[PDB]
Every structure is written in structure tokens, then in C-alpha cells.
Design a protein around this ligand. Sequence first.
Ligand SMILES: NC(=O)c1ccc[n+]([C@@H]2O[C@H](COP(=O)([O-])OP(=O)(O)OC[C@H]3O[C@@H](n4cnc5c(N)ncnc54)[C@H](O)[C@@H]3O)[C@@H](O)[C@H]2O)c1
Ligand SMILES: Nc1nc2c(ncn2[C@@H]2O[C@H](COP(=O)(O)OP(=O)(O)OP(=O)(O)O)[C@@H](O)[C@H]2O)c(=O)[nH]1
Ligand SMILES: [Mg+2]
Ligand code: NA
Lengths: 162, 185
Amino acid sequence: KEMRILMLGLDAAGKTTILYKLKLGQSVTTIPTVGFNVETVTYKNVKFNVWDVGGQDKIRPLWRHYYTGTQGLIFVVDCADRDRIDEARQELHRIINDREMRDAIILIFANKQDLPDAMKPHEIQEKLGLTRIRDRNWYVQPSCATSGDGLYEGLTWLTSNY
Amino acid sequence: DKLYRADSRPPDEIKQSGGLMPRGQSEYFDRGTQMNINLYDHARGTQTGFVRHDDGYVSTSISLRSAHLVGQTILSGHSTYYIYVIATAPNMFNVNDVLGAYSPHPDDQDVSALGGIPYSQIYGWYRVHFGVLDEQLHRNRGYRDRYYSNLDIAPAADGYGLAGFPPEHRAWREEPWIHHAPPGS
Ligand SMILES: NC(=O)c1ccc[n+]([C@@H]2O[C@H](COP(=O)([O-])OP(=O)(O)OC[C@H]3O[C@@H](n4cnc5c(N)ncnc54)[C@H](O)[C@@H]3O)[C@@H](O)[C@H]2O)c1
Ligand SMILES: Nc1nc2c(ncn2[C@@H]2O[C@H](COP(=O)(O)OP(=O)(O)OP(=O)(O)O)[C@@H](O)[C@H]2O)c(=O)[nH]1
Ligand SMILES: [Mg+2]
Ligand code: NA
């Protein structure tokens, strides 16, 4: 079985770190992503084709040109970044309201739980307005991408829930 | 459909670089410099006319014949070079469509990849020796068609915001760039 995954979120959320922690088992130093990275990862007998697309403001209009064929959305949020949680909400709802994304289940990585000021999953769920999403499954998974905690639990949710 | 990039680096070096990466990427890891993703700067290049060290784009051609002509210009001093055959994906932009009539060197006929081109996107390559394509295409075993077969280059409408004309440039007061104008332009 195969699953085409689109991983989106604002810049600095932790997307590329997640991708390379999963594919390499290691924590890498990153460059801000302006195009995309793509890797295939095998877990509990599922081949996950994960697309890591750049989240800076100027290149968000390109997100939709990756929606085709997507079976799960991974939306990564920087939980220490309270100043941008609301912008994160607006970008999420713009994604899920595109017709090409109607049937993609949504995993939220509530990332950077290691940081002191960090918003926890209850708070993230509410600041993202997720209960207004009533037409598909979603779930908020706490994570620290650098240490890898939360990631395979997220991947487990994706398999179980599709 | 496919794109074609003439490049003097051999396939083994490309594989170990993870693909065809922009110059700006090395600059970033080497001295923290942020990549320049203004398409106009990429197309204009440096005052003196050369490729910027911070360039966030990688140039490709739309035909094998154009890529070869580029190789016989830019790469004339290399007795061996490669033409990489590349699938389409949405980090690619038709420079002349995005810059429109303001494209500074429209003869380049460039389709450029923002952030570079991963190895999995490279279908294969032609070796060019003393300017001649004598050999059949060598297929990239690392290519992944299913990744790319359903994706296209970005449409120009979603490229306009990346045109990056300088702030006082008149394009910013006209369609289509006016909808992305920085403040005061
Ligand atoms: N290369 C092409 O097939 C191509 C296609 C269409 C248009 N053009 C035009 O040709 C002109 C020059 O383009 P170009 O893309 O060859 O210049 P470039 O600087 O990217 O490439 C020139 C050479 O520099 C080296 N190089 C490139 N990127 C590198 C990297 N990241 N790390 C180490 N070495 C690297 C390679 O030896 C390469 O052949 C531009 O005007 C462009 O519009 C080129
Ligand atoms: N403290 C902490 N830092 C993290 C965590 N995950 C990622 N980071 C860091 O946050 C910064 C951004 O990480 P990236 O993986 O590049 O984020 P990005 O979402 O890919 O950004 P774009 O490519 O611009 O879209 C880096 O310094 C990472 O090391 C985490 O769980 N905890
Ligand atoms: Mg990234
Ligand atoms: Na394609």
C-alpha cells in the first residue's frame, strides 16, 4: 500500500527536519525550502511518498499545484510561534477548502513541544479552528522533529485513518 | 514533457549532490547568505552580465536543440559535457512568461527551477563529446516517474509574485505585477 503525502505549513515550522529525520534517521541542518523536497519512506508496511513544499509567503501560491493525488495532508505548526498561529490557521483553511484537497485526511504536527513557551495540542486545535472542519478526519500530534518524538505516532495515525 | 539542461558536471557528481542545485544553496551553507529568488535578478544576472552567487534558480531549456546550443556557447571550453533530461514539476517557471515583455534576455528561452532539481526528477542524460551528441540517452535508474507524471511546470500566474523587479521598476505599476507590488512601487 502507498500513500501520497503533502507536507505544508509556514516557514520555520520544522517540515524539512521532519522529512530528513524520517528518511535518514538523523537531524540535519536545513536551508529554507523554496521549491520542494521529496522522499519515500517505508513504515509498518506502508510506502509514504512525502512532499515537503516551501512555506515562505511568496511561494505559498505554488502549494495548490501539488494537491493532485494527495491522500494525506501533514500540516506542521511551530508551537512556540504565537505571533503566527493565526496566519497558520488562515493558510490551513485555504488548503482544505480547495476542491483537489477535499478527501485528504489531516495530520497536524504540533511541533517544537520542547520549547518552553510551547502551545500544547488542545490550544493548537482551538487556535487552528479545527472543529470547523467536519468533512474529514483530523488529528493533532505533538512532536519535536529534532528528537523524532511524535513522528511515527503521526505516521501511525495516517495509516490507521485512511 | 521534458526539459533539458546543459551542464559540465558528470552524473556521478550530480547524484552525490542530490541533483542540480542552485548556486545560492552552497553560498548559504558556506556563509549564511540567503538565496536570491527574484526571477528578474536571475535573468539579468550581475552588472557585469554573469550568474549571481546567490542565485536560487537553476536554468533549463525547452528543447534538446536549445540545450545543445547553450552547451556550445556556455560550455564551449569543455571537451565533455552533459545534457540532463528532466521531468516537469511546479517549482519550474517559464522566465519569459513570468517577466513578460520585461524579460531582459528573452533569447535565453529559459525554464527555471526554483530551489533546484532533485535527482529523482532527472530522467537521464546525453553525453556530448567535442560538441557532438553521438550517444543514445542513458537512463537514470533513480528517476521516479510517478512523482512527476501528474505534475506540471507552474503557470505564469502563480509566478508573477516572484518576478522580483527592482522596487522602482515600472512593471510594478502594471498588470499583472501590480497585484504583487511592494509598497511604494
Ligand atoms: N544550462 C542550460 O541548459 C540553460 C538552459 C536555458 C538557458 N540557459 C541560459 O544560459 C545562461 C547560463 O546558464 P547556466 O545555467 O549554464 O549557468 P550556471 O552557472 O548554472 O552553469 C554553468 C556551470 O557552472 C557549474 N554549476 C552550475 N551550478 C552549480 C552548482 N550549484 N555548484 C557547482 N557548479 C555549478 C557547472 O559546471 C555548470 O555547467 C543563462 O543566461 C541562462 O538563461 C542555460
Ligand atoms: N527546538 C526545536 N526546533 C526545531 C524542531 N523542529 C525543527 N526545528 C528547527 O526549526 C528551524 C526550521 O526547521 P525546518 O525543518 O527548516 O523548517 P521548514 O518548515 O522546513 O521551513 P521552510 O522550508 O521555509 O518552508 C530549524 O532550525 C530546525 O532545526 C523542534 O522540534 N524543536
Ligand atoms: Mg523546509
Ligand atoms: Na511533470
